Amino acid sequence: IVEGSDAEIGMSPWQVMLFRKSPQELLCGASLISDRWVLTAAHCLLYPPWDKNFTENDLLVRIGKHSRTRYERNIEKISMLEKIYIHPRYNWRENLDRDIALMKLKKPVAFSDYIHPVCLPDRETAASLLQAGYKGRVTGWGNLKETKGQPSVLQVVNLPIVERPVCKDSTRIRITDNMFCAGYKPDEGKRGDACEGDSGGPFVMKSPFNNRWYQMGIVSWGEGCDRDGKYGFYTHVFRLKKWIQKVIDQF
């Protein structure tokens, strides 16, 4: 996260860290949608251009963390993956269209003041909240700047959703409906944006209707970290809501 700030303890009981066994290192962010299901960006597990095609038995899911490097004893919980699921129509070849994927744990995780699942949106929720101007919250353990390096504890940043037109005029990449960009305008004064290391993390919005939190987007891609004129594109979770349900129903 660029231009963010340390998170409050237990501020994201659904945040997840995709941990690479050997060599031990942060892979991506993720989110806990169930006591056994974790959602994440699809380019964290598969991305040929960079020779990335992680196999389930290659990672670990660290849930309930605030620290990036320290094994927060008595708090966090490390779980193992049973099966990885990537969207069958995931465009890693062109513009990362449908950059979504799930991860079923081998053993369900136990909730607590630090580990709690987030709500997935419904047509209604998504309808009234996904609007340009409406701020959302992004958090992760990624870079602090485009080029310090990593942070000590989980970073957070509230960003405003941007209009379709604007997003499309900020890049040369084909912007589809399965995605939306968020960020502050050069004039607006405020900054902030996700960055390498934040991928997979959750973009959430707290519903003013029932005060429950919802994950509207998944950190997907970007061109540089926090550059004026440049925004951040997140997976449009609800549009992919059907595939998610199908994957959990069948399994």
């Binding site: 659904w14 003041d113 699942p117 701020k135 919250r137």
Partner: peptide
């Protein structure tokens, strides 16, 4: 069915340092 409700905040009727910013944006 109990998601979006954090043990250390919603559960204890406590807000966080910036959540208000989101509410104030949904104008």
């Amino acid at each position: 069915a109990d998601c979006g409700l954090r043990p250390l905040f919603e559960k204890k009727s406590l807000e966080d340092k910036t959540e208000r910013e989101l509410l104030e944006s949904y104008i």
